[model samples]
Target: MPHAFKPGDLVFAKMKGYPHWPARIDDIADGAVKPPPNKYPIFFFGTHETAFLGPKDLFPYDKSKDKYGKPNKRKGFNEGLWEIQNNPHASYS
Candidate 1:
């Protein structure tokens, strides 16, 4: 099945048991290279956590507010990223 979330979309996934903190879809693995058959790495970043560099699974968040009813915008730190790498390591897929 194809992923429901896209980059920049705000989503939430279960962590321990209850609802996890909100996160933003930073990147999605595009299938270009061969091998590594099934795992589609969905990179994300938690509200106050480190970058989920290569997370394998994730779900979507419905609630977009805090207990006090403040809206949680999807804006994050990974926006406007730039890169420079050699050969196979540079591509996003």
Candidate 2:
């Protein structure tokens, strides 16, 4: 029961070398296109239309592509992200 992210839902996305981005789910594009293996229920969050301005901008899925646009990489759901306030640096459970 871990796939329940929807629009307006506040969640944190993992960012490298920085803190997670406190983003608000602005939209859900699950059925919009061919979702990846881990993106069956992907969630899009940011200042509306996914104009995120936080740590996520640093280690983007694809920096070569335009901002917020879909990347060629096939990252899974929450693949390159961390939960809200979740300790990404924790080595133990």
Candidate 3:
């Protein structure tokens, strides 16, 4: 599958069914320590945090809305992070 994000792109990443955090794609595979199988190259962002990267599957969010487009009162990150620490099996079908 084609990568949903690239360098210089603003993205939101988070675990499945979790909140997202806004991050900027600095470079491809920069600071990537662990990568997933199937040539799904990992990504590194300005935050220097590591996580399993995936396509742009979830909608972006903020303090006003949730993933379902409902009105929200809490400030939230924009996109789903694919955080490997919590979602190691999410890549699987």
Q: Which candidate leads the pack in TM-score?
A: 3
Candidate 3 accuracy as TM-score: 0.37
Q: For model 3, name the residue pairs that clash.
A: 12-79, 13-79, 13-80, 13-81, 14-80, 14-81
**Shift in Å, residue 40, candidate 2:** 8.3
Q: How much lDDT does candidate 1 score? A: 0.37
Who is ahead in lDDT, 1 or 2? 1
Candidate 3, residues 1-93: lDDT per residue as tens digits? 434554444445555664454443434345645455422233322234446556553223233234333323333321223332233223221
After superposition, the stretches of candidate 1 with alpha carbons farther than 4 Å from their true spots are 1-3, 28-47, 50-93
Model 2 spans with C-alpha error above 4 angstroms: 1-3, 28-37, 40-93
In angstroms, give how far residue 4 of model 2 lies from its true place.
1.0
Tens-digit lDDT string for candidate 2 (1-27): 333444444444444453343334444
TM-score of each predicted structure versus truth: 0.32, 0.30, 0.37
User: Backbone clashes per model, in order?
Assistant: 1, 2, 6
Whichever of 1 and 3 has more TM-score, that candidate is 3
What's the true lDDT of residue 86 in model 1? 17
Model 3 misplaced regions, further than 4 Å: 1-4, 28-34, 37-48, 56-93
